[PDB]
Amino acid sequence: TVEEANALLKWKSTFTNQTSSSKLSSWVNPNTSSFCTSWYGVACSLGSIIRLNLTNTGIEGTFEDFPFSSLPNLTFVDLSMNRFSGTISPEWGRFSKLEYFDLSINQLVGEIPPELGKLSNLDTLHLVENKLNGSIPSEIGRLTKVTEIAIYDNLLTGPIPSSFGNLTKLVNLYLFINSLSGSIPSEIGNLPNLRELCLDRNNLTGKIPSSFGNLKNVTLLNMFENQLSGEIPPEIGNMTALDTLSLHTNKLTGPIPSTLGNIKTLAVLHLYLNQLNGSIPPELGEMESMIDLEISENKLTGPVPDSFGKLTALEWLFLRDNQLSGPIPPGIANSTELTVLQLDTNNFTGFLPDTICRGGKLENLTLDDNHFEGPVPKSLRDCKSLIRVRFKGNSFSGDISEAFGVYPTLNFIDLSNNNFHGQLSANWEQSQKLVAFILSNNSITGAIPPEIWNMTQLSQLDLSSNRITGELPESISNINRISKLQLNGNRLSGKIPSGIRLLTNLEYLDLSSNRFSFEIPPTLNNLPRLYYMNLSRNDLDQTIPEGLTKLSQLQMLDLSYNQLDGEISSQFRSLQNLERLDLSHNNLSGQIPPSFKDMLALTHVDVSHNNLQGPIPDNAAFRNAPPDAFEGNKDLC
């Protein structure tokens, strides 16, 4: 006691940057009459310290003056969450009776001494969240009584010691955040009591040991973010107690093992980000407990099995970024608990099944870049729980106002590159949480419902490449949160509303290829974030307003194919960031202002088909201009 307490008191002297408010103020009297009862963090047995608990004590120092020789009876040591720096001395293995060893969350460096292997009585080993480098010693396999080994979040290298098969009592192996190398020892598959194996986020090469079929007690197998190769061993199906299997972000090849159906407890399967090929085994429909099924970003082929209808508890089905084909079986959306259905980047065909939102809980549906056709199922129209909908790049058809209902929780929708006809329903206004409405390249006619502007939360609106008619109201100001407005390629007519002035958060304006007919608003001088403005192919009929030059941040400004007349104001020199200018196909007269030579950012100009004259100012843009950039003028020197 007195020898132990004085030795601890000497070790405490090593501590640096220690405040008088520390918990170790109780270390005053070395007599057992205060050592074993009033000293914080120590607990004795038969008068001798067996327990040292100094977690989260803010101690700053090293274990160089740790009294190894003075504390024979230590069995519990937890020095985690402190500022200990240095190495792990081999003297740590001298604690014969030690059962619990925790040095996690520290600033330790160096290797793990093999002397830790002679801690025969050790049950738990925690060396977590440190910067220990080197290979795990083979001698760790000597810890026959160990049950949990956690050395993750470190800088460990080399292979896993195949002597780990000798750790029969091990139930929890945590080594994930590290740089372990080489193949997985086959002996690891022969741990009888193992329950959790987390080898993820490493540099592990080679195949997955077929011996893993013997782990009938394992419920968690995390080995993602590795360089594992070969094929998934079919003996994995014998892992009948598996709850979560994650091999994502690997270099696995070959087909999915049909033996995965035998695991009736598997609720999470993450096979994505790999190179598995072939067809989906119909036996995957027999994985009864499956909740999260992710096989995305692969090279799978063939159709989805109709057996997927037997997955009655599925919630996430990730099949995107693959080479699957054929029709969608109605059983895919059989689940009433389905919430996420990602299918983009595939080669599917045919109609959507009427079971699409059977349970009324679908949130995120993704169908981009496919060959779907036919109408939207009535179950999708009435499915109010949608959040993200992505129909982009298909051949969907039907009346756009008859296809979709109301969606109070809708956030993002993209129906671009489809064959939807009809006029826009005013039902979209009730999607008060919508921030991105993108419906470009369709066959939609009619006018924009005035209620669309009462959707104040919109930040991106894209109705481009359609046949929308009518004129934009001065109520356009109601969506001032917008930053991308793409209304180009339509039959919008009338004057451009002056309410565009008040959309100050606007970044990108595209009103081109339309039938706007009167003069540009002279009040458009307050767009401090606009870097794009395309007003080309219209009928604007007067002089360019001076207020346009007050938008300092334009990079591109296209006013081509118009009826603009008058002289090009010299105040365009103020646009210091302007890179592109297109004023072609107009009736602009006068001389090109020679103050344009001072616009260093300008690179591209087109002034063709106009009524200007005089020698052009000399800048980088005018010099490299081809002969097309000056065609059809009057007297350009």
């Binding site: 993002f412 993209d414 921030v435 991105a436 930040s459 991106q460 930053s483 991308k484 970044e507 401090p528 974030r529 870097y531 941040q553 990079q555 210091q576 960031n577 260093l600 950012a601 980088a620």
Partner: protein, 175 residues
């Protein structure tokens, strides 16, 4: 992906009172569907338009993970901290607009690797140091501005800076 995780690092080191970065959903494959971010046909981020966003915080070294990023607009905010030298990893690059901020520290010499750079505006800041010689080797720099900043040393005309005007170096306390 990689680019989306990189931009997510920025999102966590900035205070966003105006909810500008709200659309930046980390669980998406790419950040190309985010607002204020634009990609090219390859789904690589090429533009970040965060000017006048009332963003306070510190820059992030993950900004060098955007190989195709051409235009970086962080101007007109209350961002503090230093400029991480890792922005020199932006192989393709046109515009660096960091002006009108509260940035401090030196100007990293690693910006000389951005040989495609055309416009660099860092004025109205708290920058301190000297102009690297490396910035004279870009040969593509057209517009330059380091006004309203306490730097030191002489104006390096090493060849490229010969075309520039004292307005680029006004109120700089250089000479």
């Amino acid at each position: 992906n990689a680019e989306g995780d990189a931009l997510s690092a920025l999102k966590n080191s900035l205070a966003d009172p105006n909810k500008v970065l709200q659309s930046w959903d980390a669980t998406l494959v790419t950040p190309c569907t985010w607002f204020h971010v634009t990609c090219n046909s390859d789904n690589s981020v090429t533009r970040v338009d965060l000017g006048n966003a009332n963003l306070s915080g510190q820059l992030v070294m993950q900004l060098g993970q955007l190989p195709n990023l051409q235009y970086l607009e962080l101007y007109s905010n209350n961002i503090t901290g230093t400029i991480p030298e890792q922005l020199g990893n932006l192989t393709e690059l046109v515009s660096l607009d960091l002006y009108l901020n509260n940035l401090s520290g030196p100007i990293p010499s690693t910006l000389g690797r951005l040989k495609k750079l055309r416009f660099l505006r860092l004025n109205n800041n708290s920058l301190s140091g000297e102009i690297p010689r490396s910035l004279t080797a870009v040969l593509t720099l057209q517009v330059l501005d380091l006004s309203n900043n306490p730097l030191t040393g002489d104006i390096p005309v090493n060849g490229s800076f010969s075309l520039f005007t004292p307005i680029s170096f006004a109120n700089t306390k250089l000479t």
